[PDB]
């Protein structure tokens, strides 16, 4: 008759991912807070060696010490491992290699550390969206699948504006939907309000399709 058995399998798969990934944004925030000074010091004091070399060495030490930062990224990778097997792995290797090679003094290497980090930060955000993209694409409900495409696009446009703020919104919003908490569609922001609201509008549309499925189960 109907496809309730299938729709329930889809809700189940989405709910598992979201609950398993619920600390993803907090974990990226902890990387950002530890590394932001070190990133900016590399960008500043490597733009021209004149020199602050001691500052650059110390900045590199924050990214390298006890492989802590690399392992924090691997912890995020392990969260999305089931879903996007090779998304992040190359970019984590690239960073690891730059860190391995940065035995100073070498600004280019120091700038390569900073760029490989920034690129990896943005990938960790896209990885979450890509996982939801793969999950949503297994939905038998065509209205949900259409609403999911619109969400991923607005999600990605939001990432371009600010990767950590975008990831925080995506995680909280998807979280609200699978826990049946009504999504607020308004941004109260002073920075990035336009793109946040575009993203929140696509999430209200998705919440609509999600509820329409849920109400038949």
Numbering used by the authors: 19 to 235
Which statements did the authors publish about this structure?
CspZ promotes bacterial dissemination to distal tissues by evading the complement system, the first-line innate immune defense in vertebrates in the blood, through binding and recruiting a host complement inhibitor, factor H (FH). Additionally, CspZ is only produced after Lyme borreliae invade vertebrate hosts and, as such, induces CspZ-specific immune responses after natural infection. Similar to CspZ, CspZ-YA is an all-α-helical protein composed of nine α-helices (denoted as helices A to I).
Additionally, to avoid the formation of intermolecular disulfide bonds, resulting in the risk of protein aggregations, we substituted two cysteine residues, C53S and C187S, to generate untagged CspZ-YAC53S and CspZ-YAC187S. We also determined the crystal structure of CspZ-YAC187S at 1.95 Å resolution. Superimposed structures of CspZ-YA, CspZ-YAC187S, and CspZ-YAI183Y, using CCP4MG software, showed no significant differences in surface epitopes. That water molecule does not impact the intramolecular interactions in CspZ-YA, but coordinates the interactions with S187 on the helix H and E214 on the helix I via hydrogen bonding in CspZ-YAC187S(dotted lines in Fig. 6B), likely enhancing the protein stability. Thus, the highly polar nature of serine together with a slightly smaller footprint of oxygen from S187 may be the cause of the water molecule positioning in the fashion to enhance hydrogen bond-mediated intramolecular interactions in CspZ-YAC187S. Thus, the results here identified a less flexible loop region between helices H and I (R5; residues 198–221) in the CspZ-YAC187S and CspZ-YAI183Y, compared to CspZ-YA. In contrast, the Tm-values of CspZ-YA were significantly lower, 57.5 and 58.4 °C for histidine-tagged and untagged CspZ-YA, respectively, indicating a stability enhancement through mutagenesis.
